[PDB]
C-alpha cells in the first residue's frame, strides 16, 4: 500500500531459508543463490515431544503480560 | 448512581466514574490524562482502591483497639 507522505506499507511471507552467492553494488543491490534449502522430518517421535513441549512452554508463556501489551488468542 | 450504574456494557463512562471517584488532586487527573493506556490507568487505580481497603482495615483496627482499652481502663 502507497501513502503520500513517504510511507510504503509491505505485507511479506517468508517462504524458506537459502544462501547468498554474492551481490552487486547498486544502487539497488541484486543477490542470487544456488539452491533451495529444504529440510524434511525424519523421526517423528522426539520431534513431536519437543513439538508438546514447545505447546506447554507457549501456553504456560502467553497469560503473563498483562499490561506489557501481548495479546491471548 | 443505584440503578443507572448496575447492568452497564459501556466502560469508559464507567471507568471515568472510577476516575472521579477517586478523591485526590486535580493534578492526580492530569497524571491520569497523561496515561494513554487503559490497562495501567485501571491497574494503579486498583492499587488506589487496595490501599482504600488498608485504609478501611486500619480504622477497624484502630477503632477496635481504642475501645477496648478504653472499657478495660
Redesign the interface.
Known sequence: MRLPDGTLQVMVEARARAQVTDYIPGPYLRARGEVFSEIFPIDEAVVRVLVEELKEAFEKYVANH??LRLDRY | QLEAVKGTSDPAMLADTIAYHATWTVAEKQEILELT?L??RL?KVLGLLSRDLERFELDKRVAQRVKEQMDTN
Open positions: 498483562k499490561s | 493506556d490497562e495501567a491497574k
